[PDB]
Amino acid sequence: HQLQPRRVSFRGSPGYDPSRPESFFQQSFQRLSRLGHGSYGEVFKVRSKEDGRLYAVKRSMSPFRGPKDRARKLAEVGSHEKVGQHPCCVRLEQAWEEGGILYLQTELCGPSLQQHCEAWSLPEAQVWGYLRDTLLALAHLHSQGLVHLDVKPANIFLGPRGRCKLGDFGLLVELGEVQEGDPRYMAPELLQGSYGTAADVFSLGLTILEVACNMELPHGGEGWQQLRQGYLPPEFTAGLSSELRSVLVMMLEPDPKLRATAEALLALPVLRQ
Numbered sequence: 001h002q003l004q005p006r007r008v009s010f011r012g013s014p015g016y017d018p019s020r021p022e023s024f025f026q027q028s029f030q031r032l033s034r035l036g037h038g039s040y041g042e043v044f045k046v047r048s049k050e051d052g053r054l055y056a057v058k059r060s061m062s063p064f065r066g067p068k069d070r071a072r073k074l075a076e077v078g079s080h081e082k083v084g085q086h087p088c089c090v091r092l093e094q095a096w097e098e099g100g101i102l103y104l105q106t107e108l109c110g111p112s113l114q115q116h117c118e119a120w121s122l123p124e125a126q127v128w129g130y131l132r133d134t135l136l137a138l139a140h141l142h143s144q145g146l147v148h149l150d151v152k153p154a155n156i157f158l159g160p161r162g163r164c165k166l167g168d169f170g171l172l173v174e175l176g177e178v179q180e181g182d183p184r185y186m187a188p189e190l191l192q193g194s195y196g197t198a199a200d201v202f203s204l205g206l207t208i209l210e211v212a213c214n215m216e217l218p219h220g221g222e223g224w225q226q227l228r229q230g231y232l233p234p235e236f237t238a239g240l241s242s243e244l245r246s247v248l249v250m251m252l253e254p255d256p257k258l259r260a261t262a263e264a265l266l267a268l269p270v271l272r273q
């Protein structure tokens with residue numbers, strides 16, 4: 001026998017019938033396509049039986065191994081709930097656990113910035129839009145006392161008319177346990193375990209640099225150090241406007257005390273509206 005699905009929430013069932021053997025995920029949703037799969041889980045585009053609308057659902061790959069594994073996995077939901085509703089953040093609809101598997105249902109977004117780049121050099125007008133939207137997301141996170149420690153192209157998802165939304169909030173920390181971010185985008189102070197609101201501003205700077213120049217960033221070694229000195233190596237700046245370069249260098253200041261804040265960046269004339 002299997003226990004009924006349980007809602008996961010740190011706040012504290014339309015169409016679903018517990019009498020039938022099918023899971024909540026199978027009874028309550030039509031699976032339309034798989035959007036991703038890896039060690040983090042599988043993500044499906046679905047339509048909801050409850051409201052007829054499209055959503056995305058992420059489910060973990062294997063049943064909880066013990067109480068601590070469960071607690072760590074469920075903690076993603078708590079962090080995502082702290083983000084709540086914001087037009088530049090992936091919105092959580094509901095989360096539940098069944099059969100030792102964790103499910104997060106969110107709004108349905110488009111391809112990641114990584115995918116968008118891979119199937120496109122991006123026009124800079126688009127890049128300015130992604131920078132602005134993700135800056136609005138960071139301003140929101142910081143207001144909630146949250147820092148995203150894995151801002152990267154794969155974690156930003158496109159939306160309507162040039163919009164994008166930041167996601168993957170299992171990598172959020174509060175001002176908690178956290179996994180390792182991608183070294184390519186990591187703020188230099190994190191090497192010493194130091195973090196703050198400045199860290200994801202730096203990561204967003206390299207994120208936008210990478211998508212704007214369409215070149216792989218170094219994961220270590222001299223090249224990694226030379227992106228963390230307060231200048232942009234010419235290797236990465238071919239075709240970048242003077243205006244974009246200047247904003248990126250503000251974001252890439254190695255000293256987190258000196259680095260521009262999200263709000264200061266959003267207040268720049270170039271990032272109006």
Ligand SMILES: Cc1ccc(O)c(C)c1-c1cc(-c2ccnc(N3CCCNCC3)c2)cc(C(N)=O)c1N
Nearest residue numbers: 035036056057058104106108109110154167168169
């Ligand atoms: C369902 C879900 C729950 C919580 C949450 O924070 C998010 C972002 C989602 C969510 C995830 C995905 C998706 C597609 C392919 N790969 C990934 N990853 C994992 C993140 C790290 N990068 C490695 C690849 C993620 C697509 C959408 C989407 N297109 O709607 C979506 N909503």
